[PDB]
């Protein structure tokens, strides 16, 4: 029920779920996790470690060599499995059943992407069934209201006006800084504009988003950069050698309007958990005082209409558990959806299409569900062009057009409209390729 600051072997017993909420930088990932894993191995548990990103998983794989840990990019009691949250949930969605782990360790358990929410629901359900123990590691568990947690070194916090768009004058304090800054933006499109403005000022800028994270994060490990401009993905265990965080304190919220379409609402205030994790990128060196957190507004808790929790239910309704059972959301997040258990369950063929649209089509969960539940097969792209006029997708104030693999040039006008497929150039490029029956190599 209440979170703990210290690991104890009793936490590995079946039916125990423990939240370990040591403050940011206190050593959950690098110190407590190996201690748990060593004890899991000694007691012959069947253990999986769930990292939020491939970057952090590859860091764990290096940190845990010499231990029998197998990193899976997509065992019994002798080998500990390690994979990303999304890899875990993806495996639960395929016909071959996941090992019956009796110990789940989820690192950065605050991650609010649909696959992480679904993973917590499945895990917490297995624990309640008496089949496993689980440990959720995060300084900012669901519902935290503390944007200013403890840190290894004191942080200088200042509320300031943070640029939301490119600037041609003013804001000298942004560019006069001689250290390294991590700047949290609400969207890729907004980061693109901020980053271009910084580059014009002569700064060396690295941009981070979910789709580019693995390859672009490697650039931050070197000396030669001045700003990282990142979306909220860097709240999930990203390590920077930075002196300063600039925090818009803003995010976008995907919202399902009346079950018909998804809009991106905002930019609007972030949660306290998010603000704490953004600030928590700095102040991490106990012998380096003076790190700065400059933040642009207040916090607000997630409302009942954030699409990720409904999308998580769409995933969980299609994950096998035990005969006719369906997993619940982790209890502290279960009130965030009005959806009824099981209402998104698909028959077998539609479920395969649903998973293919997400994994191969790169479509958001909600959109993949609409298409699959309409009985459309994965390679039938006619729905990308037969929507109502209001669903026309624009590119540079002009309707976007696509050459289909059938040789016709069609206006992009999807039958279901999800704003996430056209929110920035890279998203639209991907969706235009999907609509044309093509796919970029991975
Ligand atoms: N590659 C590294 N080498 C040395 N120290 C590191 C490295 N990465 C992180 N640290 C430091 O180790 C400490 C614990 O980090 P971590 O275990 O990631 O904290 P958290 O509790 O947030 O998971 C922090 O002071 C962090 O700055
Ligand atoms: Cl992103
Ligand atoms: Mn401490
Ligand atoms: Mn961590």
- The distance of Cα 29 from the centroid of its chain, to the nearest Å, equals 17
Ligand 1 contact, 25 CB (< 6 A)? yes
Going from the C-alpha of 157 to that of each of 167, 220, 273, 424, the distances in angstroms are 23, 24, 16, 32
Ligand 1 contact, 28 CB (< 6 A)? yes
Residue 13: count of CB within 10 angstroms of its CB: 11
Nearest-atom number in ligand 1 for the CA of 27 is 17
Residue 145 structure tokens:
């209201």
Q: What is the residue with the minimal CA distance to atom 6 of ligand 1? A: 30
Query: Could you give the CA distance from residue 391 to residue 399 in angstroms, rounded to a whole number?
Result: 10
The pairs formed by 216-223 with CB atoms below 8 angstroms and a separation of 24 or more are 217/55
351's CB contacts (< 8 A; 6+ apart) are 93, 318, 372
Residue 422 structure tokens:
């056209």
Q: What is the residue with the minimal CA distance to atom 8 of ligand 1? A: 239
Asked if residue 25 lies in contact with residue 152, where contact means CB atoms within 8 angstroms, the answer is yes
Ligand 1 contact, 239 CB (< 6 A)? yes
Asked if residue 144 lies in contact with residue 175, where contact means CB atoms within 8 angstroms, the answer is no
Q: What is the residue with the minimal CA distance to atom 17 of ligand 1? A: 27
Asked if residue 38 lies in contact with residue 22, where contact means CB atoms within 8 angstroms, the answer is no
Asked if residue 31 lies in contact with residue 22, where contact means CB atoms within 8 angstroms, the answer is no
SS (H, E, C) 78-145: CCEEEEEHHHHHHHHCCCCCCCCCCEEEEECCCCCCHHHHHHHHHHHHHHHCCCCEEEEECCCCCCCC
Asked if residue 310 lies in contact with residue 176, where contact means CB atoms within 8 angstroms, the answer is no
First-to-last CA distance in the chain?
42
**Quick one: which H or E segment has residue 272?**
helix 272-279
Query: Could you give the CA distance from residue 45 to residue 294 in angstroms, rounded to a whole number?
Result: 44
Neighbouring C-alpha atoms within 13 Å toward the C-beta of 442 = 6
Query: Could you give the CA distance from residue 118 to residue 362 in angstroms, rounded to a whole number?
Result: 18
399 DSSP β-pair partners: 394
Query: Could you give the CA distance from residue 197 to residue 207 in angstroms, rounded to a whole number?
Result: 13
Going from the C-alpha of 83 to that of each of 61, 193, 222, 364, the distances in angstroms are 10, 34, 26, 21
List helix spans (H) across 296-362: 307-316, 348-359
* Domains observed in the chain: 1-144+303-340 (3.40.50.300), 145-251+267-302 (3.40.50.300), 252-266+341-442 (no CATH)
Query: Could you give the CA distance from residue 236 to residue 53 in angstroms, rounded to a whole number?
Result: 8
105's CB contacts (< 8 A; 6+ apart) are 33, 36, 37, 40, 47, 48, 49, 50, 134, 135, 137
List helix spans (H) across 132-187: 172-175
DSSP output for 366-410: HHHHHHHHTT--TT--GGGT-S-GGGPPEETTEE-EEE-TTS-EE
Ligand 1 contact, 52 CB (< 6 A)? no
Q: Is 153 exposed, middle or buried (0-12, 13-18, 19+ CB in 10 A)?
A: middle
Instruction: Please give the angle made by the CA atoms of 307, 209 and 225, to the nearest 5 degrees.
Output: 155
**Biggest CA-to-CA distance, the chain:** 64
Query: Could you give the CA distance from residue 361 to residue 350 in angstroms, rounded to a whole number?
Result: 15
Q: For residue 67, how far is its CA from the centre of ligand 2 (angstroms)?
A: 33
Query: Could you give the CA distance from residue 14 to residue 33 in angstroms, rounded to a whole number?
Result: 18
Question: Which candidate, 99, 105, 84, places its Cα nearest to that of 41?
Answer: 105
Q: For residue 186, how far is its CA from the centre of ligand 2 (angstroms)?
A: 9
Residue matched to tokens 């609509």: 435
For 199, which DSSP code?
H
DSSP output for 36-51: HHHHHHHTT--EEEEE
Q: For residue 272, how far is its CA from the centre of ligand 4 (angstroms)?
A: 17
Resolution for this experimental structure (Å) = 1.6
* Phi and psi, residue 33, nearest 5°: -55, -50
Q: For residue 26, how far is its CA from the centre of ligand 3 (angstroms)?
A: 5
- The distance of Cα 10 from the centroid of its chain, to the nearest Å, equals 30
């Amino acid at each position: 029920e209440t979170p703990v600051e210290c690991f104890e072997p009793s936490m590995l017993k079946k039916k125990q779920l423990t939240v370990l909420d040591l403050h940011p930088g206190a050593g959950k990932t690098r110190r407590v996790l190996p201690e748990i894993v060593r004890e899991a191995i000694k007691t012959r548990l069947r253990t999986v470690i769930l990292a939020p990103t491939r970057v952090v998983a590859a860091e764990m794989e290096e940190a845990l060599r010499g231990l029998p840990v197998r990193y899976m990019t997509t065992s019994g009691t002798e080998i500990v499995d390690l994979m990303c949250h999304a890899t875990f949930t993806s495996r639960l969605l395929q016909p071959i059943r996941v090992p019956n782990y009796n110990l789940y360790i989820m690192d950065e358990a605050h991650f609010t992407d649909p696959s992480s929410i679904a993973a917590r629901g499945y895990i917490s359900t297995r624990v309640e069934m008496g089949e496993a123990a689980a440990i959720f590691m995060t300084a900012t568990p669901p519902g935290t209201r503390d944007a200013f947690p403890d840190s290894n070194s004191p942080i200088m916090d200042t509320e300031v006006e943070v640029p939301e768009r490119a600037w041609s004058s003013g804001f000298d304090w942004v560019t006069d800084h001689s250290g390294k800054t991590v700047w949290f933006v609400p969207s890729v499109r907004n980061g693109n504009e901020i980053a271009a403005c910084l580059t014009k000022a002569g700064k060396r800028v690295i941009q981070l988003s979910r789709k580019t994270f693995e390859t672009e994060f490697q650039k931050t490990k070197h000396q030669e950069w001045d700003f990282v401009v990142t979306t909220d993905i860097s709240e999930m265990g990203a390590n920077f050698k930075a002196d300063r965080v600039i925090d818009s304190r803003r995010c976008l919220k995907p919202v399902i309007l009346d079950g018909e379409r998804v809009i991106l609402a905002g930019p609007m205030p972030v949660t306290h958990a998010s603000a704490a994790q953004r600030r928590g990128r700095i102040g991490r060196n106990p012998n380096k005082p003076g790190d700065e957190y400059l933040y642009g507004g207040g916090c607000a808790e997630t409302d009942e209409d954030h699409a990720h929790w409904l999308e998580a239910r769409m995933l969980l309704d299609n994950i096998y558990l035990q005969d006719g059972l369906i997993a619940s959301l982790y209890r502290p997040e279960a009130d965030k959806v009005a959806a009824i258990e099981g209402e998104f369950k698909l028959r077998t063929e539609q479920r395969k299409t649903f998973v293919e649209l997400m994994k191969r089509g790169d479509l958001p969960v909600w959109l993949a569900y609409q298409v699959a539940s309409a009985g459309i097969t994965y390679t039938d792209r006619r729905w990308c062009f037969d929507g109502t006029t209001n669903n026309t997708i624009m590119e540079d104030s002009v309707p976007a057009e696509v050459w289909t693999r059938h040789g016709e040039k069609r206006v992009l006008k999807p039958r279901w409209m999800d704003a996430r497929v056209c929110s920035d150039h890279a998203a639209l490029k991907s969706f235009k390729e999907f609509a044309a029956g093509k796919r970029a190599a991975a």
